[PDB]
Amino acid sequence: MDERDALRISREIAGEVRKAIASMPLRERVKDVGMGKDGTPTKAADRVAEDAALEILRKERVTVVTEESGVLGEGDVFVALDPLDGTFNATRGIPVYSVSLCFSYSDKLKDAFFGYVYNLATGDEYYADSSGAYRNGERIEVSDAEELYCNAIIYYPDRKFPFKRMRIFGSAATELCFFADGSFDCFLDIRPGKMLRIYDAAAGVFIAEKAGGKVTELDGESLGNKKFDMQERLNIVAANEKLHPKLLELIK
Amino acid sequence: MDERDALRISREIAGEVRKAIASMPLRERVKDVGMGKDGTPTKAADRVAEDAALEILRKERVTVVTEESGVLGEGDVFVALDPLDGTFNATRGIPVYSVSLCFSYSDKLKDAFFGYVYNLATGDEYYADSSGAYRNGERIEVSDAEELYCNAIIYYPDRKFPFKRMRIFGSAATELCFFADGSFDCFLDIRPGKMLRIYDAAAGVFIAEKAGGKVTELDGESLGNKKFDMQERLNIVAANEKLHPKLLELIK
Numbered sequence: 001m002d003e004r005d006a007l008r009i010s011r012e013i014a015g016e017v018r019k020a021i022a023s024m025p026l027r028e029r030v031k032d033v034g035m036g037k038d039g040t041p042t043k044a045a046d047r048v049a050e051d052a053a054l055e056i057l058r059k060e061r062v063t064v065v066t067e068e069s070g071v072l073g074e075g076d077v078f079v080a081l082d083p084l085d086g087t088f089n090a091t092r093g094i095p096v097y098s099v100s101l102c103f104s105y106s107d108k109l110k111d112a113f114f115g116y117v118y119n120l121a122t123g124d125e126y127y128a129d130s131s132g133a134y135r136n137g138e139r140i141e142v143s144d145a146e147e148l149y150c151n152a153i154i155y156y157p158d159r160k161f162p163f164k165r166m167r168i169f170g171s172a173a174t175e176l177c178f179f180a181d182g183s184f185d186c187f188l189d190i191r192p193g194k195m196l197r198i199y200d201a202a203a204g205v206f207i208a209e210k211a212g213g214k215v216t217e218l219d220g221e222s223l224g225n226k227k228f229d230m231q232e233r234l235n236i237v238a239a240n241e242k243l244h245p246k247l248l249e250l251i252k
Numbered sequence: 253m254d255e256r257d258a259l260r261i262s263r264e265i266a267g268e269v270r271k272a273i274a275s276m277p278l279r280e281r282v283k284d285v286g287m288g289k290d291g292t293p294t295k296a297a298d299r300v301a302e303d304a305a306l307e308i309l310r311k312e313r314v315t316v317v318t319e320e321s322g323v324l325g326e327g328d329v330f331v332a333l334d335p336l337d338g339t340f341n342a343t344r345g346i347p348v349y350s351v352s353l354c355f356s357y358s359d360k361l362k363d364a365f366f367g368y369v370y371n372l373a374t375g376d377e378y379y380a381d382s383s384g385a386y387r388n389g390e391r392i393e394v395s396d397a398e399e400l401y402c403n404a405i406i407y408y409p410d411r412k413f414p415f416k417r418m419r420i421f422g423s424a425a426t427e428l429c430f431f432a433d434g435s436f437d438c439f440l441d442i443r444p445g446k447m448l449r450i451y452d453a454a455a456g457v458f459i460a461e462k463a464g465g466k467v468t469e470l471d472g473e474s475l476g477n478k479k480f481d482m483q484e485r486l487n488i489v490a491a492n493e494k495l496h497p498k499l500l501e502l503i504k
């Protein structure tokens with residue numbers, strides 16, 4: 001499988017997940033239907049999105065790591081799949097939720113070759129491959145803001161901060177793309193518990209890096225050894241290379 | 253003018269503003285075109301939204317208080333208008349931005365008779381009149397959550413808080429409606445500077461109250477005497493009756 005295959009597969013998944021979610025009324029979406037392998041409830045919306053995505057991925061030689069059903073398959077290409085990132089928004093009809101896919105040539109983030117995030121409510125498509133990062137077919141890149149007085153997505157502000165704006169939209173995959181395309185100057189997830197899972201973050205991280213972003217753990221450490229399994233957890237500090245070290249200093 | 257008139261006028265305005273914004277590419281939207289009477293830049297998106305709204309409002313016997321052009325007209329019905337609440341989102345193609353209208357029989361919030369917030373990106377329509385609060389023609393009411401461990405919209409978290417989720421979408425008018433319909437359990441704007449202006453908040457406040465919400469200033473004081481002018485500023489604490497006093501204690 002190469003990056004062109006992955007783009008084709010991701011688009012087919014986006015089309016099916018979008019159709020499955022769009023037809024589901026909110027009351028239906030909101031219902032709990034089971035306990036996910038991640039340890040949080042699976043909503044009906046999560047289940048139909050995942051079934052639609054897995055029906056396509058099952059035909060490929062992959063090992064899938066996905067929120068509700070866990071680790072499936074034995075293939076050599078690993079796929080971190082979030083079939084519905086921003087479930088809370090989706091169940092409320094708040095239009096910021098996405099299907100997220102990151103393809104890697106091993107079970108580690110450093111071997112990623114493709115990242116894809118599709119906003120299921122707006123139809124915005126973000127992806128990245130060896131040729132760069134894209135939003136709806138157009139090349140994107142992170143902003144060049146150098147000052148802490150900037151536009152930040154941050155989980156969570158717990159002290160007085162110097163940002164021009166702080167936002168929290170409820171969908172890390174999409175928000176990492178908001179950072180990738182320069183809509184926001186940085187993305188931080190500095191929650192002490194380390195809450196992000198590999199499938200929440202992997203595609204956005206890859207897309208943001210291809211867009212020129214520096215993206216690391218809390219202390220500036222590489223994300224390369226983050227594993228595609230259910231146990232993996234991440235904090236994230238993401239910004240252009242000039243702003244990034246100022247952020248690291250700020251959160252100390 | 254009564255609440256039936258206000259609904260008709262608001263829908264006509266929503267239709268025109270929506271069409272004006274939808275046809276405007278993001279690069280165009282993001283351009284500064286002037287200094288607003290509120291003291292912040294008017295974006296091209298703000299100007300076309302306002303021109304479209306004012307063209308309809310000029311035919312009514314109203315005094316309009318609006319962000320970009322300030323106080324206009326001499327009519328006895330006061331209208332707090334935000335042509336485009338969530339301009340930052342609109343210029344980035346983030347689908348949470350609205351036109352907001354609150355009609356009052358005096359220049360004070362306590363005399364409001366109609367509130368209307370229309371999401372310009374999704375077409376969601378919220379309004380409230382003497383018959384209650386509505387989302388897309390269906391009656392709504394605030395949630396019944398009693399615990400601080402709840403889903404909160406908050407400007408801004410600056411300390412450790414006990415919430416289940418914290419969100420900040422960048423559109424107070426819309427977010428107050430997210431609270432009105434029970435999507436979130438509370439809405440707080442506790443920024444020390446007191447940043448909200450009357451046209452940002454008035455419609456969402458009115459809609460949230462008609463939906464059963466208790467909505468007050470920072471110390472529990474009534475919002476009834478808030479003025480429809482450019483100088484007015486607001487902090488907001490909004491929740492159902494049971495949760496509201498716990499929030500007041502929490503932020504002390």
Ligand SMILES: N[C@@H](CCC(=O)O)C(=O)O
Binds near residue numbers: 011015018123125
């Ligand atoms: N296949 C998806 C999206 C693909 C694309 O963004 O071109 C759809 O038709 O909804």
Ligand SMILES: N[C@@H](CCC(=O)O)C(=O)O
Binds near residue numbers: 089096122
């Ligand atoms: N995304 C919202 C509606 C907004 C839209 O699709 O334009 C929903 O949950 O359906």
Ligand SMILES: N[C@@H](CCC(=O)O)C(=O)O
Binds near residue numbers: 018022121122124
């Ligand atoms: N805007 C998407 C559809 C999104 C949805 O229906 O939820 C498209 O072009 O197909």
Ligand SMILES: N[C@@H](CCC(=O)O)C(=O)O
Binds near residue numbers: 150151164293
């Ligand atoms: N003109 C706006 C843009 C906001 C921004 O890009 O941070 C301002 O700077 O207030």
Ligand SMILES: N[C@@H](CCC(=O)O)C(=O)O
Binds near residue numbers: 263375
């Ligand atoms: N605001 C009206 C119609 C406006 C429009 O369709 O653009 C409504 O939602 O019923």
Ligand SMILES: N[C@@H](CCC(=O)O)C(=O)O
Binds near residue numbers: 121344345346347374
């Ligand atoms: N809000 C995005 C698109 C979202 C949607 O179409 O639902 C925009 O400004 O155009």
Ligand SMILES: N[C@@H](CCC(=O)O)C(=O)O
Binds near residue numbers: 374375
């Ligand atoms: N979907 C909305 C339009 C949203 C937009 O044009 O931004 C409607 O019913 O007209």
Ligand SMILES: N[C@@H](CCC(=O)O)C(=O)O
Binds near residue numbers: 032041403416
């Ligand atoms: N089952 C979800 C629902 C979200 C909510 O109501 O806060 C949870 O408790 O996490």
Ligand SMILES: [Mg+2]
Binds near residue numbers: 036038040041042
């Ligand atoms: Mg789950």
Ligand SMILES: [Mg+2]
Binds near residue numbers: 046067083084
């Ligand atoms: Mg998910």
Ligand SMILES: [Mg+2]
Binds near residue numbers: 289291294320
């Ligand atoms: Mg302005």
Ligand SMILES: [Mg+2]
Binds near residue numbers: 319334335336337339
């Ligand atoms: Mg405005």
